[PDB]
Amino acid sequence: ALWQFRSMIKCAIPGSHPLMDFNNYGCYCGLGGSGTPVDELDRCCETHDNCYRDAKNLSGCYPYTESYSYSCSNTEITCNSKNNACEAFICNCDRNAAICFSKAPYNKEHKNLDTKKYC
Amino acid sequence: ALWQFRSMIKCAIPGSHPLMDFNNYGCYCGLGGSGTPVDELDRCCETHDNCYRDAKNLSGCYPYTESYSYSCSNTEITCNSKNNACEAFICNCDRNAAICFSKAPYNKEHKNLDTKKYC
Ligand SMILES: [Ca+2]
Ligand SMILES: [Ca+2]
Ligand SMILES: [Ca+2]
16 A cells, blocks of 8 residues: 555655655656656656556556555565565565665655656 | 464464464354354354455455554554555454454363364
């Protein structure tokens, strides 16, 4: 579920405030994504967004509202070996994004980019 | 998921060994169960059994496979408010059943009960 996505990023990047930070960032961060990805970060958003899309190729698999199982082993993230297919697919999309976010630099210049102009 | 029910049980009844305590007791603790419940504990199980059957009334809600979110606050169990509807249902079934098995007396002469004669 989305709410677990955020907690998952806080798990990798502690000094971050997910809701604030990665919302309305570039062309892909935030709901939507159109045009080209302005940066490293934005790429991560892009790929994660396609992961959600792929995830719907699973029956009754709704990525936003599906809760799964994962633990945060101190900066380290782990998906429960027990999630069901949908769940495990969605946790992975999330796990991969999070790690990606932790390695991409953040450009204040992209927060609130002008989609409606720039994307 | 069933694994989380076991975990729930360990929270509410510390010291417990769910796979062996609550399994195969009465006419409803474990497997499937039918007939007349032999006592309070067994009665908890029948309520669980009934709860789960009502789970399936929600499209794509398989209680054994569906992982929900909850936490165990020092003996206390809390079902995440963000759980989707199905998850929420299943969370409650397990929660009511764990409280129930806590307030219930354990009758050892009802363990591995010949369900084909006493049920
Ligand atoms: Ca997006
Ligand atoms: Ca779930
Ligand atoms: Ca049963």
